[PDB]
Amino acid sequence: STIEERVKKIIGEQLGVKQEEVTNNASFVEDLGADSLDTVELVMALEEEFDTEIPDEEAEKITTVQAAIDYINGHQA
Numbered sequence: 001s002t003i004e005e006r007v008k009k010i011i012g013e014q015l016g017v018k019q020e021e022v023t024n025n026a027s028f029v030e031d032l033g034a035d036s037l038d039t040v041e042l043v044m045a046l047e048e049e050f051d052t053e054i055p056d057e058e059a060e061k062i063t064t065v066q067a068a069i070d071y072i073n074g075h076q077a
């Protein structure tokens with residue numbers, strides 16, 4: 001499978017949203033309805049899957065599904 005597929009699956013699982021709703025342009029807060037706690041738990045779930053650590057101040061600025069995919073392609077090793 002692809003990174004896009006793996007990342008979207010975790011986002012849908014974490015936020016309780018259906019797959020067809022997890023588009024690449026979608027914003028986590030406005031479009032997918034992520035709340036304060038969701039922000040924290042979603043960041044940690046992806047950090048674990050992709051064995052990486054993102055700085056909280058940088059995570060806070062990753063607003064869309066595609067921005068999250070982009071960060072993982074750039075930092076996963």
Ligand SMILES: *P(=O)(O)OCC(C)(C)[C@@H](O)C(=O)NCCC(=O)NCCSC(=O)CCCCCCCCC
Nearest residue numbers: 028029036039042043046047054059060062063068
């Ligand atoms: P709550 O009211 O206490 O907190 C609400 C607010 C103040 C909105 C905070 O969530 C906050 O800091 N908001 C800043 C603007 C905003 O909505 N930013 C967040 C978008 S969602 C998010 O942070 C999830 C990112 C997931 C992708 C990261 C994956 C990287 C893994 C390596």
Ligand SMILES: [Zn+2]
Nearest residue numbers: 001002003005
């Ligand atoms: Zn594959």
Ligand SMILES: [Zn+2]
Nearest residue numbers: 001002005006
């Ligand atoms: Zn596939």
Ligand SMILES: [Zn+2]
Nearest residue numbers: 016017018021
């Ligand atoms: Zn929905």
Ligand SMILES: [Zn+2]
Nearest residue numbers: 025026027031
């Ligand atoms: Zn949008």
Ligand SMILES: [Zn+2]
Nearest residue numbers: 035036037038
């Ligand atoms: Zn909640």
Ligand SMILES: [Zn+2]
Nearest residue numbers: 043054055056
């Ligand atoms: Zn953190």
Ligand SMILES: [Zn+2]
Nearest residue numbers: 050051076077
């Ligand atoms: Zn690795």
